[PDB]
Write a protein that binds this ligand. Sequence first.
Ligand SMILES: CCCCCCCCCCCCCCCCCC(=O)OC[C@H](COP(=O)([O-])OCC(O)COP(=O)([O-])OC[C@@H](COC(=O)CCCCCCCCCCCCCCCCC)OC(=O)CCCCCCCCCCCCCCCCC)OC(=O)CCCCCCCCCCCCCCCCC
Lengths: 69, 36
Amino acid sequence: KRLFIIKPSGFYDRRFLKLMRFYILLTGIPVAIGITLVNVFIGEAELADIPEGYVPEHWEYFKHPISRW
Amino acid sequence: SGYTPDEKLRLQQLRELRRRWLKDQELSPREPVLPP
Ligand SMILES: CCCCCCCCCCCCCCCCCC(=O)OC[C@H](COP(=O)([O-])OCC(O)COP(=O)([O-])OC[C@@H](COC(=O)CCCCCCCCCCCCCCCCC)OC(=O)CCCCCCCCCCCCCCCCC)OC(=O)CCCCCCCCCCCCCCCCC
């Protein structure tokens, strides 16, 4: 003998959670994929001495490619 | 000294209504109509 359980309408909360997850993932999965691709294909720099008669650009003092960009 | 006749009548009518309402709370065999 199954009975009906009276509950508040959970459609709207579930829909909001689905929409928020969808938008965050839509904008974040490409970001994570690009970060991983950059990390495995364009590695960090190395601390090298400044060559004689050479003034580096201001962005050449950082090691992470994203930070340099 | 027990219920008064008006109290008995009101209690009986409310009892029949409540039992009917509880009977209406049951689920038919197809009630959870799950969409595909
Ligand atoms: C979700 C919705 C719900 C609502 C959300 C609400 C919140 C909203 C959030 C909004 C956005 C958040 C903002 C944050 C942005 C920050 C991004 C960032 O900077 O990345 C940081 C960081 C990247 O650092 P980096 O500076 O870019 O790289 C520096 C290195 O040079 C690089 O190192 P490398 O050169 O070695 O390269 C390694 C490379 C590759 O490494 C590997 O592949 C190797 C891995 C090992 C596997 C080896 C074996 C496998 C294969 C071998 C087997 C096959 C062959 C042999 C077969 C044998 C057969 C038996 O991997 C990577 O590149 C790092 C991963 C990149 C992920 C970046 C994330 C960005 C997300 C931004 C948007 C977020 C939106 C959400 C969506 C997120 C995605 C779903 O990423 C990480 O955090 C990595 C996690 C490391 C943690 C390790 C775990 C340790 C746990 C310790 C704590 C223990 C306590 C318990 C706690 C447990 C908790 C887990």
